[PDB]
Design a binder for this molecule. Structure first.
Ligand SMILES: *[C@@H]1O[C@H](CO)[C@@H](O[C@@H]2O[C@H](CO)[C@@H](O)[C@H](O)[C@H]2NC(C)=O)[C@H](O)[C@H]1NC(C)=O
Ligand SMILES: *[C@@H]1O[C@H](CO)[C@@H](O)[C@H](O)[C@H]1NC(C)=O
Ligand SMILES: *[C@@H]1O[C@H](CO)[C@@H](O)[C@H](O)[C@H]1NC(C)=O
Ligand SMILES: *[C@@H]1O[C@H](CO)[C@@H](O)[C@H](O)[C@H]1NC(C)=O
Ligand SMILES: *[C@@H]1O[C@H](CO)[C@@H](O)[C@H](O)[C@H]1NC(C)=O
Ligand SMILES: *[C@@H]1O[C@H](CO)[C@@H](O)[C@H](O)[C@H]1NC(C)=O
Ligand SMILES: *[C@@H]1O[C@H](CO)[C@@H](O)[C@H](O)[C@H]1NC(C)=O
Ligand SMILES: *[C@@H]1O[C@H](CO)[C@@H](O)[C@H](O)[C@H]1NC(C)=O
Ligand SMILES: *[C@@H]1O[C@H](CO)[C@@H](O)[C@H](O)[C@H]1NC(C)=O
Ligand SMILES: *[C@@H]1O[C@H](CO)[C@@H](O)[C@H](O)[C@H]1NC(C)=O
Ligand SMILES: *[C@@H]1O[C@H](CO)[C@@H](O)[C@H](O)[C@H]1NC(C)=O
Lengths: 279, 77, 37, 326, 99, 50
């Protein structure tokens, strides 16, 4: 029950330097004003990312899933509304469906039947400020788990000059568990990825224990013909490495340093300090 | 069941501590009694107002001693 | 090819330092100044 | 002077605060299940957000074999569990000794394995009266062959035909090919060891998350400034509980904060960041003159206030009793 | 001072290692296993901590025996340079000593 | 002298400790148990005395 879309801006993937994104709190325990070195899955500093746009320009590819993913999205009015995770996407394996419904985020663990080009159908062919969504989904016969989230509401409209909407999510699927870590912060810059350091508080963990090797994103989407503002999102792949985190007295992660990037970083990881004397 | 090890360890540590105290006692206490400088000082034009004790201090440190002291968890261990 | 007092010893009479743009340079040690009597 | 018999302060009482009881865990329906699936289609269940009393099950003689590996069953009720992983199936009795980790066998390697650090408990019980079929309970199948032995706790359900050689397998059966599944022969005439056996296994983790599965609680109070024994959520320790200005996130518990010790921690049933401080300790010393001369001695407590211990003169190094200042 | 602090810090970091056991807390293993087979795990921790403590004591012994020489040298210099004049070249200063 | 004499004694008494074994006499354990489960007892004494 869907209409395929091919009105896309066919361009080669763009690349950008992920300066200092992809650091989060490792464990549930709490420390303060100490330095802790630990190894886990993280996004290495100064790494390429995959850039996709959304306005004609409706970038909806299919990307492979492995060792978790890092999803960043700059936008206004948060046009992206859903994520689909799975292996075969043909009602032959357990599939995960996340939709930020107008009330809250709805989670669906079902052996759902995807179509070729499924999307969150919104009947907004005519721009009359009508977000009436009578869209329907396909067969969902086999289901295993169902969850309802906290009703958090975010801005669904706006044409601000500076891109106030900026989401950073990290998804990690290991040991039969799905960890979602989230952060949102306004940015006054138009396109460039922010320079500096930002923490990442965990959001939720779900015991699922299924096999997923592929994913695709969903946004508010007649099949052809839409009028939405500019929006961009970046996808990054994680890697097992080792980081040294510098906590603070208030329990916030101030900074992190790699232990395999550069020789000076190796020396810093060896001496467990942020400053090294000549020698 | 392991016998007598901790007696050896405590004896060694106590010996070390007593040795340190003896070292500190031996290095400094080289004079039988204590002298004191006269209130009026005329050392042939020489000046010693930087190493002699200064009364205007909670302790009896001198100027260079204070400068040295300035140049150089606590309870978790 | 020059000679300077050693800063960061490496070994075998060869050691390096940081100097003028600016870079790390390694050279043979200098046994101080030389003069005759 | 002599240093002997280091001094310490003994505890007084205990606090056994635990979160609110919710209900009884429905493990009985698992243990009284109607039908049990095949080995490769094992019944996997997650039990959480309830209170379970395993003392009744342990005292119950309904089972046959009961091996707890990671923990001693007698005190099993004195530990809080984050989650319960219950895996159930039916196996031939003769092969039951494949349940333990580190064993070698057909089911123990081809389609069911256990991790080396497994901490759960295994129960096996004969059910020949109801599970056996007069015509043969052949509904139970298993993987006779597997290309690569699977890692522990992963399910293989593929219906691929066996490939025992490099030559390709054509059709439903080819060269060196056999059916992936073989039925179990379970009849009432089967002897000892050939009878069906219901086998269940329970797994759980320790301290990684605020647990939800516990037993009896007997929460009492939150007394402060006393050398007491705290057992808030499994961590048993001795010390004094005070109020701390330290800040927690809405999901932070069990702060270490220096090297390895459980520092200021929150509490169940409420939200206050309490602080743990060890009891007072010190090394007492005895100063004496020559015992040939006299016999009176004096006692020095090192580095500790002696406003509490059971002509005193407290000094910098500690405090001295038995002698008078001049 | 840095060496003395480092020794204690390395000694105290040792209380959080498995040493081949199943955990690193005596209370946890005591309250998680029956005493018939608790010794078989406690003995490993006991042996490891004995080894670490002995190593620390040996290091402290050697360092103190070294610093005794500096104490003696300081005592000799104080008894020679201060309470008199010493003619040993390059002992009491670099040049011709005065006081 | 005394300090040196304080060492030898603390060595000799070491010959009277279980060290985790079942006894402290090699002859007793040798004459009370067959070898194959006796090496597993003698090894502890060997390690402790080393
Ligand atoms: C030794 O030298 C010091 C430094 O000049 C002298 O201290 C000064 O004394 C004059 C006059 O009393 C003051 O105006 C200055 O303020 C002092 N200097 C400082 C830094 O306090 C000291 O008097 C000299 N000792 C003598 C002359 O015996
Ligand atoms: C990112 O991709 C571009 C082109 O795809 C490439 O030139 C560049 O080297 C890549 N970045 C890194 C760090 O390799
Ligand atoms: C989803 O959003 C709609 C629109 O606000 C609301 O009516 C509905 O109750 C929400 N929840 C579900 C489960 O549909
Ligand atoms: C997950 O699915 C992929 C593709 O179907 C498969 O290659 C892989 O072996 C599967 N892994 C697990 C653990 O099921
Ligand atoms: C820590 O938090 C408190 C209260 O939120 C604040 O007053 C203080 O400034 C913070 N510390 C730092 C270093 O900002
Ligand atoms: C001086 O340095 C240059 C630069 O490497 C080198 O080619 C040349 O041989 C050197 N001359 C001598 C005499 O060492
Ligand atoms: C479950 O079975 C046991 C023995 O097989 C019996 O004692 C118990 O009462 C049963 N419980 C239920 C709820 O049927
Ligand atoms: C626990 O239960 C008591 C009484 O039953 C109640 O007063 C308290 O608010 C409860 N606390 C929580 C965290 O459920
Ligand atoms: C004790 O001291 C007295 C006083 O000189 C002396 O006569 C006596 O022999 C001493 N006794 C011993 C056992 O040292
Ligand atoms: C310890 O004694 C000192 C000196 O009397 C006093 O100032 C301090 O408050 C005392 N502290 C405690 C905890 O008793
Ligand atoms: C020691 O002198 C102080 C200061 O006058 C006095 O308060 C104290 O009582 C004196 N001690 C004795 C034992 O007289």
């Amino acid at each position: 029950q869907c209409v395929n879309l091919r009105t896309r801006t066919q361009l080669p993937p763009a690349y950008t330097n992920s300066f200092t994104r992809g650091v989060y709190y490792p464990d549930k325990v709490f420390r303060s004003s100490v330095l802790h070195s630990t190894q886990d899955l993280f996004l290495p500093f100064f790494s390429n990312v995959t850039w996709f746009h959304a306005i004609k320009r409706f970038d909806n590819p299919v990307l492979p899933f492995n060792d978790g993913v890092y999803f960043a999205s700059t936008e206004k009015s948060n046009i992206i509304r859903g994520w689909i995770f799975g292996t075969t996407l043909d009602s032959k394996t357990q599939s995960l469906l996340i939709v930020n419904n107008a009330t809250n985020v709805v989670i669906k663990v079902c052996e759902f039947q995807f179509c070729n080009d499924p999307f969150l159908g919104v009947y907004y062919h005519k721009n009359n400020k009508s977000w009436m969504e009578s869209g329907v989904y396909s067969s969902a016969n086999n289901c295993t788990f169902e969850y309802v989230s906290q009703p958090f509401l975010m801005d669904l409209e706006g044409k601000q000059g500076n891109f106030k909407n900026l989401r950073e999510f990290v998804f990690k699927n290991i040991d039969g568990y799905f960890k979602i870590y989230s952060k949102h912060t306004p940015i006054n810059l138009v396109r460039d990825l922010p320079q500096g350091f930002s923490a990442l508080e965990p959001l939720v963990d779900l015991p699922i224990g299924i096999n997923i090797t592929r994913f695709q994103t969903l946004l508010a989407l007649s099949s052809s013909g839409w009028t939405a503002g500019a929006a961009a999102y970046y996808v990054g792949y994680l890697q097992p490495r080792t980081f040294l985190l510098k906590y603070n007295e208030n329990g916030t992660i101030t900074d992190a340093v790699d232990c395999a990037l550069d020789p000076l970083s190796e020396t810093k990881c060896t001496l467990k300090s942020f400053t090294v004397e000549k020698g | 069941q392991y016998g007598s090890f901790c007696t050896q360890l405590n004896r060694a540590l106590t010996g070390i501590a007593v040795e340190q105290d003896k070292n500190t006692q031996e290095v400094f206490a080289q004079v039988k009694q204590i002298y004191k400088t006269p209130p009026i000082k005329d050392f042939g034009g020489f000046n010693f107002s930087q190493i002699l004790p200064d009364p205007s201090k909670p302790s009896k440190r001198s100027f260079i001693e204070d400068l040295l002291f300035n140049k150089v968890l606590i309870c978790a261990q | 090819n020059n000679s300077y007092e050693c800063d960061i010893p490496i070994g075998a009479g060869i050691c390096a330092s940081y100097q003028t743009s600016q870079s790390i340079i390694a050279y043979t040690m200098s046994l101080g100044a030389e003069n005759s009597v | 002077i002599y240093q002997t018999s280091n001094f310490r302060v003994q505890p007084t009482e205990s606090i056994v605060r635990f979160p609110n009881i919710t209900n009884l865990c429905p493990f009985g329906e698992v243990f009284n299940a109607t039908r049990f699936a095949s080995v490769y289609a094992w019944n996997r269940k997650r039990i959480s957000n309830c209170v379970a009393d395993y003392s009744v099950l342990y005292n119950s003689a309904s089972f046959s074999t009961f091996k707890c590996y990671g923990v001693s069953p007698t005190k099993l009720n004195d530990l809080c569990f984050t989650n319960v992983y219950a895996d159930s199936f039916v196996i031939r009795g003769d092969e039951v000794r494949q349940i333990a980790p580190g064993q070698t066998g057909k089911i123990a390697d081809y389609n069911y394995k256990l991790p080396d650090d497994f901490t759960g408990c295994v129960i096996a019980w004969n059910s020949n009266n109801l599970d056996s079929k007069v015509g043969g309970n052949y509904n139970y199948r298993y993987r006779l062959f597997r290309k690569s032995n699977l890692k522990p706790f992963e399910r293989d359900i593929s219906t691929e035909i066996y490939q025992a050689g490099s030559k390709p397998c054509n059709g439903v059966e080819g060269f060196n090919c056999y059916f992936p599944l073989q039925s179990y022969g379970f009849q009432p005439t089967n002897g000892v060891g050939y009878q069906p056996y219901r086998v269940v296994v329970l797994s759980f983790e320790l301290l990684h998350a605020p647990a939800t599965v516990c037993g009896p609680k007997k929460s009492t109070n939150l007394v402060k400034n006393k050398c007491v024994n705290f057992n808030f959520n499994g961590l048993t320790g001795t010390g004094v509980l005070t109020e701390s200005n330290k800040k927690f996130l809405p999901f932070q518990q069990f702060g270490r904060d220096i090297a390895d010790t459980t520092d200021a921690v929150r509490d169940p049933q409420t939200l206050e960041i309490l602080d743990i401080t060890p009891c007072s300790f010190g090394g007492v010393s005895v100063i004496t003159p020559g015992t040939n001369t006299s016999n009176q001695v004096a006692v020095l407590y090192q580095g500790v206030n002696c406003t509490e211990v059971p002509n005193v003169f407290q000094t910098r190094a500690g405090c001295l009793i038995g002698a008078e200042h001049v | 001072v840095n060496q003395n602090a480092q020794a204690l810090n390395t000694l105290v970091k040792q209380l959080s290692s498995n040493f081949g056991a199943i955990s690193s807390v005596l209370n946890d293993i005591l309250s998680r296993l029956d005493p018939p087979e608790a010794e078989v795990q406690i003995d490993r921790l006991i042996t490891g901590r004995l080894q670490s403590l002995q190593t620390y004591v040996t290091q402290q012994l050697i360092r103190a025996a070294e610093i005794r020489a500096s104490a003696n040298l300081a005592a000799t210099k104080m008894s020679e340079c201060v309470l008199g004049q010493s003619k040993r070249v390059d002992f009491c200063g670099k040049g011709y000593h005065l006081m």
